[PDB]
Design a protein around this ligand. Structure first.
Ligand SMILES: CCOC(=O)/C=C/c1ccc(O)c(OC)c1
Ligand SMILES: CCOC(=O)/C=C/c1ccc(O)c(OC)c1
Ligand SMILES: [Cl-]
Ligand SMILES: [Cl-]
Ligand SMILES: [Cl-]
Ligand SMILES: [Cl-]
Ligand SMILES: [N+]
Ligand SMILES: [N+]
Ligand SMILES: [N+]
Ligand SMILES: [N+]
Ligand SMILES: [N+]
Ligand SMILES: [N+]
Ligand SMILES: [N+]
Ligand SMILES: [N+]
Ligand SMILES: [N+]
Ligand SMILES: [N+]
Ligand SMILES: [N+]
Ligand SMILES: [N+]
Ligand SMILES: [N+]
Ligand SMILES: [N+]
Ligand SMILES: [N+]
Ligand SMILES: [N+]
Lengths: 250, 250
């Protein structure tokens, strides 16, 4: 605002879970605010999401970035996380933003699974969200679940176990059952305002096809396929992903 | 079990919320178990649900019945309840039931909004649940949210407010935005094992067309129209409701 600029730690509640975020507070009385969503097994402070927030703040656009339930500093077990209770988290954060009287327009920015959270959130709030940016949005998480292969890790898609080991973590059977029947496109397509879609052509975690499908379902989308970029927009592509996002929001 | 029979109060957790229930434990080393789900604004101990759990226990079918979040003895504000978070409540209860070693077949039994919870849960666990009984399932709550008229309380369905004063209660805006888009029949229709559908013909809260519709989506359903019954299967209608429920779960 006019008196404090820079970062602050903010905590919210969603059903007796506490969610821990970082607010990037710009100069100015009135401003636009982006809610930024990290991906699966990630947290609010990846390089991509840090640089996103920072670039946004340099253009006077506020932001908040939170750890989803079961990730980062936020409460709850990873095994109990699903895309749906992430939407619930995202709604608790949308409550916080929409009641700050500094905020003018609200933007949603999500990477990977946080892109699916963003796109379905905007589809529930198409009357409130103004612009949305999706980076490598992971709608393919639904097909992976129908196939029985989530990021290497395999199961029978018709006999899903109670839990699945997944690196050093424990993934919940319910995550996968919800994943198989997520109405991603059905919900996301309710949002008819400006969408920015950024995806790397060398993404091997989430097919570019995912962004090509989002480009079909939105009537107001712009698609950027970044030649050579990976899933994380690593190395030289990160600045590319970050300027696209910033440019679009202004 | 073979040593203890009779009731107990169970406490479960879901996302930092305590869910309070009643477990009825029958005779035998091995038995089937019913999960009984109450409706919108109701609780686990309505006359109807006590009588279901009693009739079941006479057949040595075990049951549990929990207050959903925002109801009865359970945690959370009513205004923060949604059908989605009730499904998550329901999944937490299912975790408890499915991990009991005495339990053979798991049945779902849901009244009104508890019917929607039940049908959706069965659709997500079509490999685990053995049988479903829906009493006046409120699948009409979605169309009601799309029209903008929930039990006579009207609001703009394209501009859903933050909160809706709702007769001595305050229903959450996010309840309504979820309801509009819940994929009730899509998910429910994945359950291809036996379903028993029961609806009174004089229900004025949930149109009988709801049970008619399920009986069309389902690959193995049986429809019981109770001539003259009300939404809550009151007085004489209750024993008919209960017997149909009991006989079916056998
Ligand atoms: C941080 C980047 O990673 C993601 O967000 C991935 C989302 C996602 C992609 C494919 C899947 O099969 C899946 O189910 C676990 C999730
Ligand atoms: C306690 C017994 O009854 C119920 O569960 C009723 C549920 C219900 C019916 C129609 C609706 O438009 C609705 O939106 C909140 C909810
Ligand atoms: Cl699970
Ligand atoms: Cl015994
Ligand atoms: Cl009663
Ligand atoms: Cl009967
Ligand atoms: N200010
Ligand atoms: N985030
Ligand atoms: N399978
Ligand atoms: N969307
Ligand atoms: N588009
Ligand atoms: N036993
Ligand atoms: N309910
Ligand atoms: N109530
Ligand atoms: N009751
Ligand atoms: N009931
Ligand atoms: N409430
Ligand atoms: N609510
Ligand atoms: N009603
Ligand atoms: N509003
Ligand atoms: N709400
Ligand atoms: N939907």
């Amino acid at each position: 605002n006019l008196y404090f600029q820079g970062m602050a730690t903010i905590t919210l509640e969603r059903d007796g879970l506490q969610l821990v975020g970082t607010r990037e507070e710009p100069f100015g009385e009135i401003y636009d605010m982006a809610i930024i969503f990290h991906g699966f097994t990630a947290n609010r402070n990846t390089s991509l999401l840090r640089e996103i927030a920072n670039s946004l703040r340099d253009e006077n656009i506020a932001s908040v970035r939170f750890d989803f339930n079961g990730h980062g500093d936020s409460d709850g077990k990873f095994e109990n996380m699903t895309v749906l209770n992430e939407i619930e988290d995202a709604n608790a954060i949308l409550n916080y933003v929409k009641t700050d009287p500094h905020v003018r327009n609200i933007y949603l920015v999500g990477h990977a699974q946080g892109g699916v959270v963003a796109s379905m959130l905007a589809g529930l709030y198409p009357d409130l969200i103004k612009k949305v940016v999706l980076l490598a949005p992971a709608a393919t998480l639904k097909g992976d679940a129908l196939e029985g292969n989530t990021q290497g890790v395999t199961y029978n898609p018709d006999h899903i176990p109670d839990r699945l080991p997944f690196k050093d973590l424990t993934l919940g059977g319910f995550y996968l059952r919800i994943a198989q029947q997520l109405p991603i496109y059905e919900v996301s397509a309710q949002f008819t305002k400006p969408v920015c879609l950024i995806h790397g052509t060398d993404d091997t975690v989430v097919s570019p096809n995912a962004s090509k499908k989002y480009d079909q379902i939105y009537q107001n989308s712009t698609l950027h396929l970044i030649e050579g970029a990976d899933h994380c927009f690593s190395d030289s592509y990160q600045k590319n992903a970050v300027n696209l996002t910033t440019d679009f929001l202004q």
